[PDB]
Enzyme design. Structure first.
Site, PDB file in Angstrom:
ATOM      1  N   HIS A  61       0.841  -1.194   0.000  1.00 45.46           N
ATOM      2  CA  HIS A  61       0.000   0.000   0.000  1.00 45.46           C
ATOM      3  C   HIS A  61       0.882   1.252   0.000  1.00 45.46           C
ATOM      4  O   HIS A  61       1.614   1.481   0.962  1.00 45.46           O
ATOM      5  CB  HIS A  61      -0.958  -0.017   1.195  1.00 45.46           C
ATOM      6  CG  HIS A  61      -1.878   1.165   1.242  1.00 45.46           C
ATOM      7  ND1 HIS A  61      -2.919   1.345   0.349  1.00 45.46           N
ATOM      8  CD2 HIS A  61      -1.946   2.187   2.126  1.00 45.46           C
ATOM      9  CE1 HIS A  61      -3.563   2.462   0.677  1.00 45.46           C
ATOM     10  NE2 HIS A  61      -2.986   2.990   1.740  1.00 45.46           N
ATOM     11  N   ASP A  63       0.884   5.226  -0.270  1.00 50.64           N
ATOM     12  CA  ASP A  63       0.161   6.488  -0.214  1.00 50.64           C
ATOM     13  C   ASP A  63       0.857   7.582  -0.995  1.00 50.64           C
ATOM     14  O   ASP A  63       1.999   7.884  -0.679  1.00 50.64           O
ATOM     15  CB  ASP A  63       0.117   6.943   1.229  1.00 50.64           C
ATOM     16  CG  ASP A  63      -0.678   6.010   2.063  1.00 50.64           C
ATOM     17  OD1 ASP A  63      -1.878   5.836   1.814  1.00 50.64           O
ATOM     18  OD2 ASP A  63      -0.075   5.420   2.971  1.00 50.64           O
ATOM     19  N   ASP A 175      -8.059   1.037   1.825  1.00 52.70           N
ATOM     20  CA  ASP A 175      -7.790   2.048   2.835  1.00 52.70           C
ATOM     21  C   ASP A 175      -8.766   3.241   2.986  1.00 52.70           C
ATOM     22  O   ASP A 175      -8.708   3.903   4.021  1.00 52.70           O
ATOM     23  CB  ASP A 175      -6.354   2.549   2.738  1.00 52.70           C
ATOM     24  CG  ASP A 175      -5.730   2.908   4.091  1.00 52.70           C
ATOM     25  OD1 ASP A 175      -6.168   2.403   5.156  1.00 52.70           O
ATOM     26  OD2 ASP A 175      -4.721   3.645   4.132  1.00 52.70           O
ATOM     27  N   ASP A 312       1.629  -1.404   4.456  1.00 60.33           N
ATOM     28  CA  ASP A 312       1.989  -0.075   3.931  1.00 60.33           C
ATOM     29  C   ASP A 312       3.472  -0.094   3.550  1.00 60.33           C
ATOM     30  O   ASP A 312       4.349  -0.480   4.340  1.00 60.33           O
ATOM     31  CB  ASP A 312       1.710   0.991   4.966  1.00 60.33           C
ATOM     32  CG  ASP A 312       0.232   1.221   5.167  1.00 60.33           C
ATOM     33  OD1 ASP A 312      -0.580   0.473   4.590  1.00 60.33           O
ATOM     34  OD2 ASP A 312      -0.103   2.191   5.886  1.00 60.33           O
ATOM     35  N   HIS A 442      -6.822   9.371  -0.450  1.00 59.47           N
ATOM     36  CA  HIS A 442      -7.468   9.266   0.851  1.00 59.47           C
ATOM     37  C   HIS A 442      -6.688   9.883   2.031  1.00 59.47           C
ATOM     38  O   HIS A 442      -7.178   9.816   3.168  1.00 59.47           O
ATOM     39  CB  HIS A 442      -7.877   7.810   1.166  1.00 59.47           C
ATOM     40  CG  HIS A 442      -6.727   6.846   1.172  1.00 59.47           C
ATOM     41  ND1 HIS A 442      -6.293   6.178   0.044  1.00 59.47           N
ATOM     42  CD2 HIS A 442      -5.876   6.474   2.173  1.00 59.47           C
ATOM     43  CE1 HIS A 442      -5.242   5.425   0.350  1.00 59.47           C
ATOM     44  NE2 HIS A 442      -4.969   5.581   1.630  1.00 59.47           N
TER      45      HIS A 442
HETATM   46  C1  LIG Z   1      -5.629   5.378   8.558  1.00 60.80           C
HETATM   47  O1  LIG Z   1      -4.355   4.805   8.211  1.00 60.80           O
HETATM   48  C2  LIG Z   1      -3.977   5.085   6.850  1.00 60.80           C
HETATM   49  C3  LIG Z   1      -2.692   4.323   6.654  1.00 60.80           C
HETATM   50  N1  LIG Z   1      -2.922   2.925   6.199  1.00 60.80           N
HETATM   51  C4  LIG Z   1      -1.960   5.056   5.511  1.00 60.80           C
HETATM   52  O2  LIG Z   1      -1.957   4.299   4.291  1.00 60.80           O
HETATM   53  C5  LIG Z   1      -2.691   6.415   5.369  1.00 60.80           C
HETATM   54  O3  LIG Z   1      -3.591   6.378   4.238  1.00 60.80           O
HETATM   55  C6  LIG Z   1      -3.462   6.530   6.683  1.00 60.80           C
HETATM   56  O4  LIG Z   1      -4.491   7.518   6.610  1.00 60.80           O
HETATM   57 ZN   LIG Z   2      -3.467   4.717   2.813  1.00 57.71          ZN
END
Ligand SMILES: CO[C@@H]1[C@@H](N)[C@@H](O)[C@@H](O)[C@H]1O
Ligand SMILES: [Zn+2]
Ligand SMILES: *[C@H]1O[C@H](CO)[C@@H](O)[C@H](O)[C@H]1NC(C)=O
Length: 1016
Positions: A61, A63, A175, A312, A442
């Site tokens: 994952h 981001d 996510d 992640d 997100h």
């Molecule tokens: C809530 O946790 C999420 C984590 N898994 C990150 O990938 C980021 O998107 C964060 O907001």
């Molecule tokens: Zn995320």
């Protein structure tokens, strides 16, 4: 022909509103599966002739910004993950990997040497690396507008088609913080066959798991027939991490995350580490792992099991690839060779899982339930409902909607022509699309990134706004200049945009004053653009350096105008009051522009020595004790003063609004004969808990119901004009303004929460509407869904996203609040609506962000407030899960999201200027929009192609006769059409070759895409 989206309640197995009404939501300790139960299975279920097929799907994952910026993560993590995926997949032909975020992939791929590009294409073509979804990002599903969800999907998939020659048909959304049916809506109209979701309320996972309803055909809430349905897999457990993906017991699953043995700085919080698989332990290890799998399999209906393997930013180090792969390979070799397990396990991709599930379905092995509804508001545990991010970083949430519109307008204005490469049109539009698409992430629009990452998104969006402005103004110049005169300098600013609401008065002094004077420049051309496909009138305003200005159209017909002062509010740190100051150098001129469908209209502003015949001047009344003088230079009407008092205003034949002595709405009277309906604005504050869990960027954990903001004796400014009137009041943290132009008022809040730590400011409407526990909120600007307030849930669970509007109604009366930005809101008591304005939180909420929200900045929130009689409207039955706007409310929403664009000619004289563009464009029915117009080909293409996304909403029938409107055939908007095709919404697949090259209009609630081809 078209499905009736109002009168036919769909019959579905699971309807989420009904499920919510029936569920108890008890948070009991389920054992090792903390939010479930102790799963039992019959060991005899699987045998030689019926094996459990297990697909272990490696993933990472990534981001596009969160704790680091996009570029920081790319340099530190993602480029290494992709480089090592390429090497490891190349060298290990049975290893597999899925990839979601194309923003990263495109960055990586364009930096690769040609040999590695070819290696990469090979592992994609051979099925080892598989793209899932293929959007630029994995977007938020709560605050995002459907138009931008489609934009980012199209951006990623267009890149994948061009470079990778693939288009994903399975979606992966592990996510986003809760899930919206807008996703299957868009995906199913974009060629998808399957989708996966994860973050749904733990009580929902338990309920659906008990009924084996975690795989379902997800259809829209209004869809009676089911043609919108998309197969959906909801994962069952608390996380997508390895501990929560092998089975119900994370203490066991953690031992199968081979990155957690110590050297990588990771460990298992359940205190049992992974151990390297050997011939001496493989039997025992397999027994434990297969037992977890078979427990997981109990929650689903086929003999095909999905086991994601990732987390992640995983798969970064070569040693990590090895440690996961080799250990799983030893497990598979044992398990698959031991007939007593009756398991066949392998690395797989997401599409391989779904293909096998549907093979099982077709073999008669399973039937799947139908489902409609949404999956908001998410809670991951206890009372931790993720409704905070419906409001966090509201400046950027508003910016998203501004940029949304500027991208549409830039793409549409520039689509009319083919442009030379030197004009850099495609370049600037690609940049703008990509920066807006990135922000759909997100942790972007959700306001859940670290401060410096928020700054990066803002800078990217500012650059995108400038790109859109450049493209728009070059386009206006070309569209409205006599062709044999047109002589473009592609770097020159022929026009500057004038935007009255972004960043907004009190936020940035960004607008240019039109400087006129006998000794400098007597007149100025301005041009309005209307991106909507119907004729539109709207008041527009410009700053001018004199009050003595009159307006004409290009046929030199006078246009009625109003001049008002330019008022700015100041927190006076000396007097300790918030009060308005008037400019003595610039003034606002306001007039009604009338603009063709998808067209342009030119006007001229001319200075004179004295008050022009067709320009009137507003009066101004400042209500405060202890007033001081307010000079306004040449402005011809002296400001009046008074003690605070109740006031009433009426513009045109519109409603009469009454205000309290604090400058807040108290009633609306629709017609001169009708009643004064109580409608009361109030500002309140929520705080934060002193014990237990604290609110942060994700979570809303209020310390009880909101408390009124103490208002003091605020200063109220009343401006009364023939075309526009307003009441503005300087409240603590909010300059609140109600603006009247003869229809539903516009509300603007300049919100500056300042240094108020641990405070969320809410705007509430109190009415007499007997709404009970029902209210309606929209999903992604696409559809309105019925909500029911549940007193069995905490306050924060009754908050929902308000991406574009909300309403309450009873048998007779409706109040709709339309927004120009996504925010969180609710109806916490019968007759109320409320919407959060901003939130400033000192504490982190333990989801990894590692900060509170303390980077607030002034934001101008905008709304329209529509009070209507609805007793004559044909509404859905009481059991229908949808609601629908009236045309007035729909038009009000369009006025906020897609206003007219305004352009001020930069130079002194515009030679060859024309008065109008688009007068011959069809004026389509009010429920139809051209959401997207995009030229798809560069100027070198012999056959030009232009893509259109058409969206028809559904408006309530309330007895207003339908007027004559013109059929919109987008395929004939550009000349010399040679072909018209219906396509997927991303334009990437042709679905139908259209007879007569005529693009049919779409049904209510449907969205279609068409591409016209033109000989050039
Ligand atoms: C809530 O946790 C999420 C984590 N898994 C990150 O990938 C980021 O998107 C964060 O907001
Ligand atoms: Zn995320
Ligand atoms: C890629 O995929 C298609 C199938 O969609 C295949 O038939 C074709 O040979 C390839 N096309 C390319 C590389 O353009």
């Amino acid at each position: 022909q078209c499905q009736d989206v109002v009168q036919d309640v769909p019959n579905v197995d699971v309807q989420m509103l009904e499920l919510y009404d029936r569920m108890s939501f008890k948070d009991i300790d389920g054992g090792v599966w903390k939010q479930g139960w102790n799963i039992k299975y019959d060991p005899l279920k699987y045998n030689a002739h019926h094996k459990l097929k297990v697909f272990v799907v490696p993933h990472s994952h990534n981001d596009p910004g969160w704790i680091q910026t996009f570029e920081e993560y790319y340099q530190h993590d993602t480029k290494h993950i992709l480089s090592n995926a390429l090497r490891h997949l190349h060298d290990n032909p049975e290893m597999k990997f899925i990839w979601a975020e194309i923003s990263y992939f495109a960055r990586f791929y364009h930096d690769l040497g040609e040999n590695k590009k070819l290696q990469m294409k090979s592992i994609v073509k051979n099925g080892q690396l598989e793209f899932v979804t293929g959007g630029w990002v994995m977007p938020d599903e709560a605050n995002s507008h459907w138009r931008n969800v489609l934009l980012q999907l199209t951006e990623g998939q267009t890149w994948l088609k061009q470079f990778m020659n693939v288009t994903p048909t399975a979606s992966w959304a592990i996510d986003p913080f809760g899930h919206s049916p807008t996703m299957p809506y868009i995906l199913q109209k974009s060629g998808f066959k399957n989708m996966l979701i994860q973050r749904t309320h733990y009580s929902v996972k338990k309920e659906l798991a008990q009924q084996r309803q975690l795989e379902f055909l997800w259809r829209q809430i209004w869809d009676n027939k089911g043609d919108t349905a998309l197969f959906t897999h909801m994962m069952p457990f608390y996380s997508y991490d390895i501990p929560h993906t092998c089975g119900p017991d994370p203490k066991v699953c953690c031992q199968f995350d081979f990155k957690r043995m110590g050297s990588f700085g990771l460990s298992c919080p359940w205190k049992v580490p992974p151990r390297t698989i050997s011939d001496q332990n493989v039997a025992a290890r397999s027994d434990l792992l297969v037992d977890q799998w078979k427990k997981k399999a109990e929650l689903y209906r086929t003999n095909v099991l999905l086991i994601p393997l990732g987390d992640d930013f995983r798969f970064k180090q070569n040693t990590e690839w090895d440690v996961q792969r080799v250990n799983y390979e030893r497990l598979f070799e044992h398990i698959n060779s031991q007939a007593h397990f009756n398991v066949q396990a392998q690395f797989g991709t997401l599409q391989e899982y779904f293909d096998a599930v549907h093979q099982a379905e077709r073999a008669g092995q399973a039937e799947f339930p139908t489902l409609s509804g949404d999956f908001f508001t998410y809670a991951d545990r206890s009372d931790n409902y993720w409704s905070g991010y419906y409001t966090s970083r509201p400046y950027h949430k508003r910016m998203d909607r501004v940029l949304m519109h500027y991208v549409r307008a830039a793409e549409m204005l520039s689509a009319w022509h083919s442009w030379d490469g030197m004009a850099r049109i495609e370049e600037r539009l690609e940049q703008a699309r990509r920066e807006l698409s990135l922000f759909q992430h997100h942790d972007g629009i959700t306001g859940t990134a670290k401060t410096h990452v928020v700054v990066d998104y803002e800078q990217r969006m500012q650059e995108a706004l400038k790109a859109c402005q450049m493209v728009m103004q070059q386009s206006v110049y070309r569209l409205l200049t006599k062709p044999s005169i047109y002589s473009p300098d592609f770097s020159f600013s022929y026009f500057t945009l004038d935007d009255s609401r972004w960043p907004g008065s009190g936020v940035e002094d960004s607008r240019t004053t039109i400087i006129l004077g006998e000794d400098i420049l007597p007149s100025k051309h301005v041009v309005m653009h209307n991106t909507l496909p119907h004729w539109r009138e709207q008041l527009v305003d410009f700053y001018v350096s004199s009050p003595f200005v009159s307006v004409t159209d290009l046929a030199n017909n006078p246009v009625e105008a109003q001049v008002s002062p330019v008022w700015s509010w100041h927190h006076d740190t000396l007097t300790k009051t918030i009060h308005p100051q008037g400019s003595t150098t610039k003034y606002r001129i306001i007039f009604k522009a009338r603009v063709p469908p998808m067209g342009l209209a030119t006007y001229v502003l001319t200075i004179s020595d004295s008050k022009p015949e067709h320009t009137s001047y507003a009066s101004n009344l400042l209500l405060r004790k202890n007033p001081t003088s307010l000079p306004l230079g040449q402005y011809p009407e002296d400001v009046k003063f008074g003690d605070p008092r109740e006031i009433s205003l009426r513009v045109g034949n519109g409603p009469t609004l009454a205000f309290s002595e604090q400058g807040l709405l108290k009633s609306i009277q629709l017609t001169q004969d009708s009643p004064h309906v109580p409608v009361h604005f109030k500002f309140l504050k929520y705080g934060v808990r002193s014990h237990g869990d604290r609110s942060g960027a994700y979570l809303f954990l209020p310390n009880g119901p909101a408390s009124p903001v103490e208002l003091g004796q605020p200063v109220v400014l009343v401006t009364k004009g023939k075309l526009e009137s307003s009441v503005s009041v300087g409240l603590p943290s909010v300059v609140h303004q109600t603006i009247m132009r003869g229809g539903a008022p516009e509300i603007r809040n300049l919100v500056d929460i300042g240094s108020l730590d641990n405070t969320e400011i809410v705007m509430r409407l109190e009415t007499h509407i007997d709404s009970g526990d029902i209210f309606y909120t929209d999903l992604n600007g696409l559809q309105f869904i019925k909500r029911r307030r549940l007193d069995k849930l905490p306050l924060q669970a009754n908050y929902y996203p308000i991406p574009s509007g909300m309403f309450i109604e009873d048998a007779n009366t409706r109040l709709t609040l339309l927004t120009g930005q996504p925010l969180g809101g609710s109806s916490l008591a019968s007759g109320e609506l409320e919407i959060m304005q901003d939130r400033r939180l000192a504490s982190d909420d333990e989801r990894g962000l590692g900060q509170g929200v303390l980077d607030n900045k002034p934001v101008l929130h905008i709304y329209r407030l529509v009070l209507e009689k609805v007793n004559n409207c044909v509404r859905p039955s009481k059991l229908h899960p949808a609601g629908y706007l009236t045309s007035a409310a729909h038009k009000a929403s369009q006025s906020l999201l897609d206003p007219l664009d305004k352009f001020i000619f930069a130079e002194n004289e515009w030679i060859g200027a024309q008065g109008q563009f688009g007068g011959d464009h069809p004026s389509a029915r009010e429920d139809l929009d051209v959401s997207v117009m995009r030229r798809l080909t560069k100027s070198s293409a012999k056959t030009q192609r232009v893509g259109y996304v058409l969206h028809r909403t559904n408006l309530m029938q309330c007895g207003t006769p339908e007027e004559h409107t013109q059929k919109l055939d987008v395929c004939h908007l550009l000349p010399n059409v040679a072909r018209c095709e219906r396509t997927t919404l991303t334009f990437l697949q042709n679905l139908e070759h259209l007879d007569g090259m005529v693009a049919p209009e779409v049904c209510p609630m449907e969205t279609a895409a068409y591409v016209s081809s033109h000989s050039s």
